[PDB]
Amino acid sequence: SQVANNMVDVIPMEFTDFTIRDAVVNILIHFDRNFYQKMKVGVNPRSPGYFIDGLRALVKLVTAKYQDLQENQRFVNVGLEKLNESVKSLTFEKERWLNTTKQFSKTSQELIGNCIISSIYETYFGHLNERERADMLVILKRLLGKFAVKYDVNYRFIDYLVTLDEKMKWLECGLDKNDYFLENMSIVMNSQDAVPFLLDPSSHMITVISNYYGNKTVLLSFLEEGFVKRLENAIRFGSVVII
Amino acid sequence: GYPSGKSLSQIYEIYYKAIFKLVPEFRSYTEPFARASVHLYNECKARYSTGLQSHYLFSPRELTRLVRGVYTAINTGPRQTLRSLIRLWAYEAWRIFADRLVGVKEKNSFEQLLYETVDKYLPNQDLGNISSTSLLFSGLLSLDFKEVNKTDLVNFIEERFKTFCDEELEVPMVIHESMVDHILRIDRALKQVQGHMMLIGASRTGKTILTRFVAWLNGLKIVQPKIHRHSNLSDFDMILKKAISDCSLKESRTCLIIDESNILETAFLERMNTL
Amino acid sequence: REDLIKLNTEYKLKLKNLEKRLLEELNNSQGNMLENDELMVTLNNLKKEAMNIEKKLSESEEFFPQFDNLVEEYSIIGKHSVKIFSMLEKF
C-alpha cells in the first residue's frame, strides 16, 4: 500500500461514491493477493512484481484515456458553438445532442475502473489460459463490485485497447483469427515499458512481427556466435530485434 | 559436544564482565544479561528448528556473535542508561537470531520470546516497543552508535538516496518502513570486520539496489561479476583475483555483489567458499 | 454476433468520420453557396445511422442474455470433448 500510493500520487481523478485513491490501491492489493492465491502453486517462492508493473500500466493508461476523453468532450463542445451560430429543420435534432453530452459523465465514471481491468490484462493475464483469464476477470469484476468504482458491464478487452486500423494490420501479417490470439497480440504491442516474452510452438509469430517492422526486422538467437556483436549493432542503429 | 546450558551461562557472564568495564554503572547487570542471552539461545534453538527451515541452526557461536555485537555498540556509543543497554542487547538479539527467520508466525514468536526473557531476567517498566521496526540503532546520524528517531532517519535516507540516485545509476523508488529497517541491517553487516550478508528477497523487492546504496554510504567499491552464458571459471577467477589484489595491495575496500545467476558451476560457488 | 460488435465500432468510427466531413465543409463553404446541404442530406442519412446504433443497442440487451444461455449447453458438450482430446493426446 505504501508503494502503490506513491505511484498513484498523480491525481487525474474526480469524486466517487465510497476515498477514491484509497479504493484503487486496495483493489490492486486484493487482486494480487487473489492472483497468487488462485493461480500459482508451490509454497511462497514468488512475490510482488506484477503489482508494480500493474500500477505502472494504470498510470500510463488513465493518462492516455483521460486526455482522450477530454479531447472528445472538446470535439462535442466545439460543435455546440458552431450549431448555435447557425440557429433549420434538421439542425435542432443535432442541438438536442445532450444525450451524448449527458452520456459523457457516465463514460467518465467508469474509465478509472476500466483502466484497472485493462492494466490487469496486460500484466497478470499474458501467460493465462482462455478459462484462467475469464475466471480471474470475474474475481476482478466482483472486486470492482465491492469497491465503489464503476466499470463497463458490457466490456471487451479487445475493442477497448485495439484500434480497427491496427487490428487489420495484425491480421494482414498473418495473426490467427482467435480472440485469445488477439488479446495476446494486444498485450505484446500496447505496452512496451518492458520487453515481451513470446512463447509459441509454431514460430508463426516470428514472422508476424517481422511483417510489421519489415526492413528494420533483424533476427537473432541467443545460440549464434555473432550474437554478442550483432546486438550491439542492432542497438546502435535502431534495429527492431526478435531473439 | 556443547556445554551445559549452565556453563554457557557462566562463560558469557565472564564475557559480559569484560565488556561492562566500559559501563561500570551496570556491573551488577552482567549476570542477568548472560542468563538472558543463554535463555534466548536455548529458546530460539528450540522454537525454530531445521524441521521448519534448513537454515534454522543455532550454536554458541550465536551467543559469541551477540556478546561481541553488544560490545561494539557500547565501545562506540553514548554513555548508557539501563534502558539503553537492554535495547542495545535487544537489537543485537534481533539481528543475530531473527533476521534469518522466514514469514511472520515465527517472527512474531521471537517478539514475544524477547519480551518474555526481559520480563524474566531484567524486570523494568522502562522498555518500549521491542519489535525490530521500533528499535533502530545507527551511526549514520550520530557520531556515536545510538538509537535514532524514525522521523530523523527516514529524512536522512531520503536526502542521501536522491544524491545516490543523482551521483550513481538513475533509478527512482519509494523509501518505506521495511526498507529503513533493512538499510541498517546491511549497514551493520558491511561495518563488521568480516561482513558477509546473504539477502533472501524474492525478486524486485529491491535487495540488489539497497545493497548498492548502503555500500555507497559505507564508501565501498561495488563490484558485480560480469558473467554470461559463455563465461569460463577463468573469467570469474580474474574478476576475483583483481578484487583481492586491490583490497590488500591497493587498500580498495570493495563490496562484491554476487547474485545466484553468477554461480554458473559447482566450482564458482567453491571459489566463493574459499573466500 | 460478428456484425453486432463490428457495426458497433464501425458506425461509431463512421460517426467520427462524418463529424470530420461536416466540419471540413462548414469552414470551406461558408463563403461559397449552401453546399453544406449536400452533406446535410448525408446527415439526413445519419438519422438512420445514429438511430441504427440505438436499434442495435436495443437488440443487444436481448441477444447477450441468449448468448450466455447457449454457453451452458456447449459447456456440457465442451467439457467432454477436452477429456476426449486429452485421452487421444495421451496415446
Chain A contact for C23 (CB, 8 A cutoff): yes
Burial grade of B40 (CB within 10 A; 0-12, 13-18, 19 or more) = buried
Residue B211 makes CB contacts below 8 A (sequence gap 6+) with: B186, B199, B222, B255, B257
Provide the residue type at B49 as one letter.
Answer: S
Instruction: Please indicate whether, in this complex, the C-beta atoms of A47 and B103 are within 8 angstroms of each other.
Output: no
Beta-bridged to residue B138, according to DSSP, are B146
CA dihedral over A61, A65, A67, A68, signed as positive or negative: positive
Sign of CA dihedral C30, C34, C36, C40: positive
B204 CB neighbours in chain A (<8 A) are: 47-49, 52
Structure letter (DSSP) for residue B258: -
Give A6's contacts in chain B (Cβ within 8 Å): 174
Mark B147-177 as b/e (b = at least 16 C-beta within 10 Å). Answer: bbeeeebeebbeebbeebeeeeeeeeeebbe
**Cα–Cα dist B141/B175, whole Å:** 17
- A194-215 exposure pattern, b = at least 16 Cβ within 10 A, e = fewer: eeeeeeeeeeebeebbbebeee
Distance from CA of C90 to the nearest CA of A (A): 18
Sequence-ordered strand ranges (E) for B117-225: 137-138, 146-147, 221-223
C72 grid coordinates: 451452458
From CA A45, how far away is CA A50, in angstroms rounded? 15
Chain A residues touching residue C23 (CB < 8 angstroms) = 79, 82
Q: What SS3 state is found at C89?
A: helix
Contact B16, B67 (CB under 8 A): yes
Residue A211 to residues A178, A206, A230, C68, C84, Cα–Cα distance (Å): 19, 9, 21, 37, 37
* Residues paired with residue A94 on neighbouring β-strands, in sequence order: none
Scanning every residue of chain A, which has its alpha carbon at the shortest distance from the alpha carbon of B200? A45
Please tell me if residue C47 touches chain A, with a CB cutoff of 8 Å.
Answer: yes
Q: CA–CA distance from A82 to each of A86, A88, B22, C23, C30 (Å)?
A: 7, 13, 88, 9, 12
Cα A163 off chain centre by: 12
Say what angle helices B150-167 and B207-217 make with each other, to 10 degrees.
90
Question: Is the separation of the CB atoms in A187 and A122 below 8 Å?
Answer: yes
What single DSSP character describes residue B24?
G
d(CA A25, CA A5): 7
Phi first, then psi: give them for residue B138, nearest 5 degrees: -155, 155
In contact, C43 and C23? CB cutoff 8 Å: no
**Inter-residue contact A49 to A35 (CB < 8 Å):** no
Torsion of CA A119, A120, A125, A126, to 10 degrees: 20
- A156 alpha carbon, distance to own chain's centre: 11
The partner residue sitting opposite A47, judged by closest CB among B174, B176, B205, is: B205
Q: What is the DSSP code string of B175-187?
A: --HHHHHHHHHHH
Q: Which residues of A touch C5 (CB under 8 A)?
A: 156, 159
**Whether the Cβ atoms of residue B46 and residue B29 lie closer than 8 Å to each other:** no
Q: How far apart, in whole angstroms, are the C-alpha atoms of residue B113 and residue B119?
A: 10
Residue B256 φ then ψ, to 5°? -95, 110
CA B217 – CA A161 distance, rounded (Å): 45
- CA angle A91/A97/A99 to nearest 5° reads 155
Query: Largest Cα–Cα distance of chain B, in whole Å?
Result: 62
> Which has the closest alpha carbon to A167: A155, A153, A181?
A181
Burial class (CB in 10 A: 0-12, 13-18, 19+), A166: middle
Min Cα distance C64 → chain A (Å) is 9
Q: Label residue B221 exposed, middle or buried (CB < 10 Å: 0-12, 13-18, 19+).
A: middle
> Which of B140, B163, B148, B35 is closest to B91 using CA atoms?
B148
Q: Which of B176, B202, B230 sits opposite A3 (nearest CB)?
A: B176
**Cross-chain residue pair A48–B177, CB shorter than 8 Å:** no
What's the rounded Cα separation, in Å, for the pair A210 and A217? 6
Residues of C in contact with A82 (CB under 8 A): 23, 26
CA distances from B2 to B60, B64, B259 (A): 8, 14, 35
Choose the closest CB to A48 out of B177, B204, B229: B204
- Three-state SS at A13: coil
Distance of CA B132 to CAs A1, B36, B97, B152, B199, Å?
A: 20, 18, 12, 17, 17
**φ/ψ (deg, to 5) at B255:** -115, 115
Burial of A117 by CB count in 10 Å (0-12 exposed, 13-18 middle, 19+ buried)? buried
Which H or E run includes A180?
helix A179-190
Q: What letter would DSSP give residue A49?
A: S
- Which among B168, B247, B181, B240 is positioned nearest to B209, based on CA atoms? B168
* Chain A: residue whose CA lies nearest to C11: A164
Q: How many residues does chain C have?
A: 91
How large is the angle between the packed helices B7-19 and B60-75, nearest 10 degrees?
10
Q: Comparing C-alpha atoms, which of B12, B19, B4 is closest to residue B35?
A: B12
- Which residues lie across from B221 on neighbouring strands? B254
In 3-state terms chain A splits into helix, strand, coil percentages (rounded to 5) of 65, 0, 35
Resolution as reported, in Å: 30.0
Determine the residue of chain A that is closest to C22 in CA distance. A79
